[PDB]
Amino acid sequence: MKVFNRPILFDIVSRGSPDGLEGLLSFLLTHKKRLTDEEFREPSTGKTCLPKALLNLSAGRNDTIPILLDIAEKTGNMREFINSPFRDVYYRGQTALHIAIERRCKHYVELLVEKGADVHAQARGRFFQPKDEGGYFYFGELPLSLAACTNQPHIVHYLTENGHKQADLRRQDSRGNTVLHALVAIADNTRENTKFVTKMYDLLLIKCAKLFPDTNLEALLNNDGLSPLMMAAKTGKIGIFQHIIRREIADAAAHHH
């Protein structure tokens, strides 16, 4: 018979060969194992094969992934498999969705959500960093906040509008930061950054006001006690700060004389 283990399975997925995975389903069923078992997790990180699949793409496409989820579904292990948290020196509590968003793959993002991904999995930092090469980069922890801070409107649209399970815009991270707070966090003072940060900020309020009309986003405070506007002031984010003021003056035009 055909027998499997971590290194073999990790080689198959890292190379990206779907032909190698045949008779894996049968192995798991007979030996009574799942892909989330410690023996198939990289002990150093906690990564299963799914992240490793997403970290090795042949022009944005690893073909092991679709079958991996099909197999997971046939062993009563789908929700667990997708949401399996791993860690590196930069982050703990990462998930397959974070990588899917990070690498900017709409398709794999769509797939995971539809098959039961946790849209509120928080990628928390570890020990802290500099600006120089340090793939840390605080983005607000949540998948929505990550996508927002990397200029990916279609993912934001999907995460909010999808049929299976939607991403709550009101959701706050460990710092107390909503997606708006995150947009301020990343906001540097260059016009092209300020372009999309401003654009994404306004799109979200417009989106939220509709869905949850009895709650204002920019009204929610963080653990410092600050709002997106005030935090922009304190941390010195000029471009975004002006825009929020410049916006509300325009919103005061709900007052005809």
Please describe what this structure looks like.
The protein has one domain: Serine Threonine Protein Phosphatase 5, Tetratricopeptide repeat. The protein contains 13 helices and two strands; from the N terminus they run αααααβααβαααααα. α1 packs parallel to α3 (49-55), α10 (179-186) runs parallel beside α12 and α12 packs antiparallel against α13 (238-251). The chain has a two-stranded antiparallel sheet with strand order 1-2. The chain is elongated. Helix content is 47%, strand content 2%. Belongs to the transient receptor (TC 1.A.4) family. TrpV subfamily. TRPV4 sub-subfamily. Homotetramer. Interacts with Ca(2+)-calmodulin.
The top-level CATH class is: Mainly Alpha
Characterize the overall form. Answer: elongated
Side by side, the strands of the main sheet go 1-2
Helix content: 40-55%
Which band does the percent of strand residues land in? under 5%
CATH architecture: Alpha Horseshoe
Report, as a whole number of angstroms, the end-to-end distance: 83 Å
The CATH topology name reads Serine Threonine Protein Phosphatase 5, Tetratricopeptide repeat
Number of E-type strands = 2
Quaternary structure: monomer
Q: Can you count the helices?
A: 13
Can you tell me the number of structural domains? 1
PDB class: membrane protein
Keywords: ankyrin repeats, ANK repeat, Ion transport, Ionic channel, Receptor, Transmembrane, Transport, membrane protein
Assembly: monomeric
Entry title: Crystal structure of the chicken TRPV4 ankyrin repeat domain
